[PDB]
Amino acid sequence: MKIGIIGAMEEEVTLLRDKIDNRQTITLGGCEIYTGQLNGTEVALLKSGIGKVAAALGATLLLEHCKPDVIINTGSAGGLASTLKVGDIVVSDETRYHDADVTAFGYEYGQLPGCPAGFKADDKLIAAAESCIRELNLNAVRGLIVSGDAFINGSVGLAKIRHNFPDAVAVEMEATAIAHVCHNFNVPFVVVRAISDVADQQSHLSFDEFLAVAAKQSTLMVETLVQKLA
């Protein structure tokens, strides 16, 4: 089995990169792919850069060159569910764009022409993720994760998302793009992130302080998940 992992930032992939045995690096299209074994399992870890287009480009390359059986998207997120604290885990059961709007032609808000309104994560991946959270005794929320090309920092940006997607448990900037690419290539996908901030007026400060903690916890989950899937 070959597991694909994608993260956006250096801080989000660096801990996992260090655990890869017999690691080799490729650079292409501004993305770095690190291949090798993580605790015996073949992985390919991509550092995509930030936002929807950087993620889609990275995901397409990973699929085409490394042909993984599944993809796991890791890193930080903004917490929207009230029970979430910094460091806690969020797992996607679904992803939607919070900033897509073709409602003039009668599409659902967030839906793009030719796409489902939302991309459902793979049930088996979700089940395995849940079993890891339980084994590690971590606090987690499963649900809808929304993505857009905006860092959410309270005020109107946050209000708009809460209004349009009241069931969204977290916000980030890459997940739904990776889900979209995976849908088109029919490859199983899941998001396993950790909370760096709660996307409010303090989110820029919380994010700076807690990105490292979010990277540490998401890395813990992802390596536990890789081990379970094998």
Q: Is 203 in the site for ligand HCE (CB under 6 A)?
A: yes
Please list the residues that pair with 119 across neighbouring strands.
95
Please list the residues that pair with 141 across neighbouring strands.
90
Q: Is 112 in the site for ligand HCE (CB under 6 A)?
A: no
Q: Is 151 in the site for a copy of itself (CB under 8 A)?
A: yes
- Residues in 183-222 that interact with a copy of itself by CB under 8 A: 183-185, 203-204
Q: Is 112 in the site for a copy of itself (CB under 8 A)?
A: yes
Q: To the nearest 10°, report the CA torsion of 4, 181, 219, 14.
A: 80
| Beta-strand relationship, 140-147 and 89-97 | parallel
DSSP state of 9: S
Question: Which residue in the list 93, 172, 197, 223 is annotated as catalytic?
Answer: 197
Residue among 224, 229, 218 nearest 76 (CA):
218
Please list the residues that pair with 21 across neighbouring strands.
37
106 phi/psi in degrees, rounded to 5? 85, 10
- Residues in 159-188 that interact with ligand HCE by CB under 6 A: 171-174
Q: To the nearest 10°, report the CA torsion of 123, 197, 167, 7.
A: -30
Binding track over 116-145 against a copy of itself, x by CB under 8 A: ------------------------------
Cα separation of 123 and 105, whole Å?
32
Asked if 187 and 2 touch (Cβ cutoff 8 Å), the reply is no
Among 90, 175, 181, 191, binds a copy of itself (CB under 8 A): 181
Asked if 151 and 173 touch (Cβ cutoff 8 Å), the reply is yes
Assess whether 93 carries a catalytic annotation. no
Assess whether 12 carries a catalytic annotation. yes
Stretch touching ligand HCE by CB under 6 A, among 27-35, 70-78, 82-90, 119-127: 70-78
Cα separation of 34 and 18, whole Å?
10
Quote the least distance from Cβ 184 to ligand HCE, whole Å: 16
**Which of a copy of itself, ligand HCE, none has residue 204 at its interface (CB below 5 to 8 Å by kind)?**
a copy of itself
Instruction: Give the interface with ligand HCE as residue ranges (CB under 6 A).
Output: 8-9, 50, 75-78, 102, 105, 113, 151-152, 171-174, 196-197, 199, 203, 207
Instruction: Give the interface with a copy of itself as residue ranges (CB under 8 A).
Output: 29-31, 49-54, 56-57, 59-61, 63-64, 97, 99-105, 112-114, 148-151, 153, 157, 176-177, 180-181, 183-185, 203-204
Residues that are catalytic:
12, 197
